[PDB]
Amino acid sequence: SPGLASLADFPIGVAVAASGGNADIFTSSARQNIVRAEFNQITAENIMKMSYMYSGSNFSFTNSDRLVSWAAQNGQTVHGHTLVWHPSYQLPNWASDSNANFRQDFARHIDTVAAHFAGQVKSWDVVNEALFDSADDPDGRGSANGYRQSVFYRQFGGPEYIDEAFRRARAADPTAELYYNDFNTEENGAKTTALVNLVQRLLNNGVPIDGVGFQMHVMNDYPSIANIRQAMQKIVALSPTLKIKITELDVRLNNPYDGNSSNNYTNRNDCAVSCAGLDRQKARYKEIVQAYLEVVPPGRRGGITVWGIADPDSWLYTHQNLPDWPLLFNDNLQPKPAYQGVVEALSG
Ligand SMILES: [Ca+2]
C-alpha cells in the first residue's frame, strides 16, 4: 500500500457519514476498508453537531460514542465537529433567544460534551463559523465588526461566547487541541481580515485557542493559490505556536460564480471517465497540500482532512443543480487523479 496517512507526520483525515444512507461508515465495508487503508483520523460529517448530543433536554451520546469507538478500533483519531455552531437545524432546544437560562445551558453544553469525550477525541472545532458571510446570512441580520449575529452572539451581546467556549473546553478536557474553524478565510479578502481581527482578539484576551481550521471548500480555479498561501501566512504570523489545520477540503470543477457559464460541465457523463477538470483537480489538490506544507511550520501542522470518502457521498455531488466530483475516490470507489495529487505533495 502505503496509504496517504503513512506519507505524513500530521493527521490525514476524512469526514465520515453515520446517518444510515449509502455512505454510512457503520454499514459500508468498502468505505471502512478505505478509511483503514488511507486515513488516520476521522471527523463526524454530521453526528457530532450540537443537537445530536441531546434526546429532548437530556444528553445522549449513544451514537457518537459508537463512532468514536469505531475510530479507536480502526486506527483513527477523532476531530470533534463541533461544540458551537449557528445553524437552526442543529441547535439544541435551549439555544433560543426565549431561554432566560441560555448562558447556563451554554456552559452545561461545553462542560458536558468536552468532558465526555476526553481521551477519545484529539481536537475540537470549538467554535465553527463565527465570522459573518453574506453568502450565509439567510435572515439578513448583517455584520457586526465581522461577526455573525448568531443566537450565541445575540445572547452574549458580543463575541465573548467564543472566549468562554474555549475556556470551558480547555478546563473540561485539557488534552484536546482547540480550534477555531471557518470557510472562505482562504480567499485572502474581507473574511480573512475579519479572521485576523477575531484571532488577535482571542490572543489579546489570553484565550486558550490552539489553532485555526481552514475548511478549504475550494474551486478548481478559485481562489488563487497565491491568495490561499497568503491567508494561511497571515494566520501563522499571529503567534509562535498557533496550529493550522485544513479541516474540510474538497475541490469543485464547476464554478458558478466565475462569470462564465460556457465552461460549466452540465452533464454527469462529462467527467465520469476523463475531462480537463479531473486533471486540474489533481494539480489543485497537489498545490494546496504543497502550500500548507510550505507555509505551516513543522510542529504546527494540525492536519489535512478531506470532506468525505467518495464523490457520491459529497455535499457537493449535486449542488445548485449541477453535478460535481469533489473528492479523492469516485463513485465506484476508485482513486482519482486527485488522490495522486495528494500523494505527490506529501511525498515531495
Ligand atoms: Ca463557470
| CA 343–ligand 1 middle distance (angstroms) | 28
The reply to whether 38 belongs to the active site is no
CA distance linking residue 53 with residue 282, whole number of Å: 37
3-state secondary structure of 205: coil
**H or E segment to which residue 246 belongs:** strand 243-252
Whether 38 and 331 have beta carbons less than 8 Å apart is answered as no
Long-range Cβ contacts of 295-300 (<8 Å, 24+ apart): 295/229, 295/232, 295/233, 295/236, 295/244, 296/232, 296/236, 296/243, 296/244, 297/236, 298/9, 300/211, 300/236, 300/241, 300/242, 300/243, 300/244
**H or E segment to which residue 346 belongs:** helix 337-347
Instruction: Count Cβ atoms within 10 A of the Cβ of residue 264 and give its class: 0-12 exposed, 13-18 middle, 19 or more buried.
Output: middle
Whether 194 and 203 have beta carbons less than 8 Å apart is answered as no
To the nearest 10°, the Cα dihedral for 301, 306, 307, 311?
A: 180
| CA 253–ligand 1 middle distance (angstroms) | 9
To the nearest 10°, the Cα dihedral for 258, 259, 262, 268?
A: 40
- Of 129, 164, 177, 344, catalytic: 129
Long-range Cβ contacts of 114-118 (<8 Å, 24+ apart): 114/83, 114/168, 114/169, 114/172, 114/173, 114/176, 115/172, 115/173, 116/59, 116/61, 117/64, 117/68, 117/78, 117/80, 117/173, 118/172, 118/173, 118/175, 118/176
DSSP string, 95-118: -STT-TTHHHHHHHHHHHHHHHTT
Sign of the torsion angle spanned by Cα atoms 263, 249, 83, 232: negative
**Torsions phi, psi of 169, nearest 5?**
-70, -45
Task: Name the domain count of the chain.
Answer: 1
| CA 265–ligand 1 middle distance (angstroms) | 8
Backbone dihedral region for residue 172 (phi beyond 0: left; psi -120 to 50: alpha; all else: beta): alpha
- Of 248, 287, 294, 344, catalytic: 248
Alpha helices in 9-85 (DSSP H): 29-38, 62-73
Residue 85 CB partners (closer than 8 Å, separation 6+): 49, 50, 125, 127, 128, 129
| CA 309–ligand 1 middle distance (angstroms) | 25
The reply to whether 160 belongs to the active site is no
| CA 136–ligand 1 middle distance (angstroms) | 21
Q: How far is CA 156 from CA 53, 148, 160, 195, in A?
A: 22, 12, 6, 19
* Axis crossing angle, helix 102-116 with helix 160-172, rounded to the nearest 10: 40
Method used to solve the structure: X-ray
Q: How far is CA 172 from CA 67, 90, 104, 208, in A?
A: 21, 22, 16, 12
DSSP string, 295-319: HS-TT-EEEEEES-SBGGGSTTSEE
Nearest by Cα to 247 from 299, 288, 194, 278: 288
Whether 323 and 272 have beta carbons less than 8 Å apart is answered as no
Question: Do the strands 54-55 and 58-59 form a parallel or antiparallel pair, or are they unpaired?
Answer: antiparallel
| CA 238–ligand 1 middle distance (angstroms) | 35
CA distance linking residue 187 with residue 162, whole number of Å: 23
| CB-based burial, 22-52: b 16+ in 10 Å, e otherwise | ebebbebeebbebbeebbbbbbbbebbbbeb
Amino acid letter for position 321? N
CATH number, domain with residue 192: 3.20.20.80
| CA 261–ligand 1 middle distance (angstroms) | 4
| CA 146–ligand 1 middle distance (angstroms) | 29
Give the range of the structural domain holding residue 186, as residue numbers without chain letter: 1-348
What's the angle, vertex CA 146, arms to CA 319 and CA 184, rounded to 5? 30
CA distance linking residue 102 with residue 56, whole number of Å: 16
Cell 491568495 belongs to 227
| CA 72–ligand 1 middle distance (angstroms) | 42
Q: Which three cell numbers stand for residue 154?
A: 445575540
| CA 302–ligand 1 middle distance (angstroms) | 33
Q: Where are the beta strands (DSSP E) in 7-48?
A: 12-16, 41-44
Amino acid letter for position 174? P
Instruction: Count Cβ atoms within 10 A of the Cβ of residue 135 and give its class: 0-12 exposed, 13-18 middle, 19 or more buried.
Output: exposed
| CA 315–ligand 1 middle distance (angstroms) | 19
